Amino acid sequence: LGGLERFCSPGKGRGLRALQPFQVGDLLFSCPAYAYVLTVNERGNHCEYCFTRKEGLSKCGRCKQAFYCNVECQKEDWPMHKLECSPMVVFGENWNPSETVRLTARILAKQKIHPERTPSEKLLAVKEFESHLDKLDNEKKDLIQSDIAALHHFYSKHLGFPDNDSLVVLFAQVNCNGFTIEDEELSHLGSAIFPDVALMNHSCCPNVIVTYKGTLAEVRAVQEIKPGEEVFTSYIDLLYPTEDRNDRLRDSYFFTCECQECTTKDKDKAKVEIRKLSDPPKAEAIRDMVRYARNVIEEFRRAKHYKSPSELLEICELSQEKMSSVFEDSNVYMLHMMYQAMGVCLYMQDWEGALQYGQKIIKPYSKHYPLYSLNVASMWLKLGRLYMGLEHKAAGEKALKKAIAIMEVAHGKDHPYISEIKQEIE
Ligand SMILES: CCN(C(=O)CO)[C@H]1CN(/C(=N/C#N)Nc2cccc(OC(F)F)c2)N=C1c1ccc(Cl)c(Cl)c1
Ligand SMILES: C[S@@+](CC[C@H](N)C(=O)[O-])C[C@H]1O[C@@H](n2cnc3c(N)ncnc32)[C@H](O)[C@@H]1O
Ligand SMILES: [Zn+2]
Ligand SMILES: [Zn+2]
Ligand SMILES: [Zn+2]
């Protein structure tokens, strides 16, 4: 950092520019989390302060509902954990703020405790975050209002608040600039604010990838970067077609991408691969599958909220059956449901069924994603741990090696995950 600088990039509000070349694999900069939270389902598995996984975690005696490496982690998290420690007890069962409210509460405590610029904000301050307030519709304002309501309700014991308009601003800023922290398998660990990382604008063919080392964000080049060019990361999963991606970006971030990918659209035809039946299906038909697919994707978002693994699995198979009438297995809509089914299979400790979906998914992933992709890497990694688990040592070794090859670029040669995975090549 300083190796680069900010600049008021066109059509793009602000963004980040290289002053020097970066090679593939190079660490552009890193950014300690300004605020963060460990996701509720990872309670008991990871330290709430540093996010390390441990079998042996010391508990908060106070509320017996937060876990730490040791008394230093616990002490260091206290200022934040105190926002939730006693209210979890008053509320018990009914303590259930969204992750966004939990993160936003910590921002507010941070601003109070440390109003000045932090090391997390060398180029973009939290106070300066784009909010797109003027673009939010009733629905999005309504959701933020719920969030404000929840915040007051749950965090009043030890937090005071600013007026409503300031809060609406803050929550909008959070949606526009908040990150998720995910592990080596892209499992959700929590959410965070990385202000200097958030200065980076998006591309569907990014030249950098963002990874996490505990709660520290790191940014590395996945294409060579020339002096004067804009540093772009991806805000979304790059698997989907150009339309599906831009619906996402406009909805979450109020812009339409004009990157080479979203322009030429060169990868679209392959993502929507169609089966060759002596007499093909006509276009009418296709639309009805495509619409049926996305539609389903939205409906599967749901059943996770409550349905049995047995019955989530069931919908994946039926949807795949139907869909395959006209879609090839290499088709992304087929890959989505395969992926989701693989997730279900892993939750049931159904290793072999997880493995079958994995094997069908990986080769299309490599086609559809770019050269260095956390999605491809985490799929190889999952394949390799499944093979090793069934004692297919040779295939496991090969798959774990493919993940390492990507991760060395994206996470760095010395990342602790690499170290873990190398030991596993055994
Ligand atoms: C898929 C890649 N992303 C990751 O965060 C990867 O770790 C997206 C996804 N994204 C968010 N998703 C969610 N949820 N951010 C987010 C959005 C709303 C709220 C939120 O935190 C909540 F706790 F407040 C976090 N935010 C992302 C993101 C990526 C790059 C940049 Cl520069 C920024 Cl500002 C956001
Ligand atoms: C995390 S911010 C990036 C920093 C932002 N450009 C700024 O000055 O605050 C997310 C926002 O930046 C803008 N942005 C990012 N990538 C863009 C792109 N490719 N084209 C246009 N605007 C973009 C969008 O307004 C987006 O919601
Ligand atoms: Zn506690
Ligand atoms: Zn710790
Ligand atoms: Zn694009």
Curated annotation (Swiss-Prot):
It is found in: Cytoplasm, Cytosol; Nucleus. Keywords: Chromatin regulator, Cytoplasm, Metal-binding, Methyltransferase, Nucleus, Phosphoprotein, S-adenosyl-L-methionine, Transcription, Transcription regulation, Transferase, Zinc, Zinc-finger. Changing residue 426 to K: Strongly reduces methyltransferase activity on p53/TP53. Zn(2+) 2 binds at residues 60, 63, 81, 85. GO terms for cellular component: cytoplasm; cytosol; nucleoplasm; nucleus. Its main location: cytoplasm. Belongs to the class V-like SAM-binding methyltransferase superfamily. Coiled coil: none annotated. S-adenosyl-L-methionine binds at residues 12-14, 132, 201-202, 253-255. SMART domains: SET. Changing residue 182 to K: Abolishes methyltransferase activity on p53/TP53. One of its GO terms (molecular function) is lysine N-methyltransferase activity. Its EC number is 2.1.1.-, 2.1.1.354. The keyword Nucleus applies. The keyword Zinc applies. A zinc finger (MYND-type) spans 47-85. Zn(2+) 1 binds at residues 47, 50, 69, 73. Induction: Expression is repressed by CEBPA. This is N-lysine methyltransferase SMYD2. It catalyses: L-lysyl(4)-[histone H3] + 3 S-adenosyl-L-methionine = N(6),N(6),N(6)-trimethyl-L-lysyl(4)-[histone H3] + 3 S-adenosyl-L-homocysteine + 3 H(+); L-lysyl-[protein] + S-adenosyl-L-methionine = N(6)-methyl-L-lysyl-[protein] + S-adenosyl-L-homocysteine + H(+). Changing residue 424 to K: Reduces methyltransferase activity on p53/TP53. Protein-lysine N-methyltransferase that methylates both histones and non-histone proteins, including p53/TP53 and RB1. Specifically trimethylates histone H3 'Lys-4' (H3K4me3) in vivo. The activity requires interaction with HSP90alpha. Shows even higher methyltransferase activity on p53/TP53. Monomethylates 'Lys-370' of p53/TP53, leading to decreased DNA-binding activity and subsequent transcriptional regulation activity of p53/TP53. Monomethylates RB1 at 'Lys-860'.
